[PDB]
Swiss-Prot record, chain A:
This is Probable cell wall amidase LytH. GO terms for cellular component: extracellular region; outer membrane-bounded periplasmic space. Residues 7-171 form the MurNAc-LAA domain. Its main location: secreted. The keyword Hydrolase applies. Its EC number is 3.5.1.-. It is found in: Secreted. The chain holds residues 117 to 291 of 291 of the full protein.
Amino acid sequence: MLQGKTIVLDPGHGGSDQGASSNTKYKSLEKDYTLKTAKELQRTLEKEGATVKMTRTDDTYVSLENRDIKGDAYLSIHNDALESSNANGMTVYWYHDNQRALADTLDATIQKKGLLSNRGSRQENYQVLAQTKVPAVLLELGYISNPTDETMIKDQLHRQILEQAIVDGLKIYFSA
Amino acid sequence: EVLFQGPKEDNIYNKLIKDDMTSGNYDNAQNIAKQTINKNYADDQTYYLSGMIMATINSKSEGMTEWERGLRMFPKSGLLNFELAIANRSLNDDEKALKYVRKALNADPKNTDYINLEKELT
Ligand SMILES: [Zn+2]
């Protein structure tokens, strides 16, 4: 059951580290939108009866090493830039064996509801994934470099579709 | 007066729907949206919000059905045409997505988001 589990949310970047930024008139900063996303997901997860730990709760710098918080699952939230502005969509990254089921489960439910192109579940060595024994995934929830993804990253109603689809995946992930 | 320089006011129904959606009460949002559409009090934003609700709690497929229904009533809606362009891009139907965004550009040829997506899809 998802109810009673501890979920760690890691909004990427923060503080002096802005993360990626769009080139449009919006001049969006990745650090601002990962944190909005994590705070929204925190509320929805707590309504579902999960305990939520945040690697940061405000616009503060946190080193990758200091993002190693324990839980039953761990979701790193990013809105990175790709060099082609036409590249777009959502990716879920896993690295250790025990992270794959989480990435495969979330990729399936997010595809059903989210308005992002599905770039799939991929194996990649990110330090927040490699440094932890917790089932952890890195979510790219749209690329801030893509103008049309950016319109959805900036939009609470689109974010909330993504956030519900993540909750849907966690409920399947924790079905035992 | 000064209220044409300002944003378009949401009507009361859309504001109630949105407020339930952002407080996470998608059940009550859906009921308010349903009643608004059935009484014929809906505008294109009502159909937009209704399908967004469906994408959130039902499926993207049902959301897209609801937006297409809204376009039958509001064929020149930039909101609904843009949203269906985004949705069809997410399903890798870029030829259909490009049709939709060009309709949205018909409504609003200076809109930089519509321009950006059409540029992307061209
Ligand atoms: Zn990032």
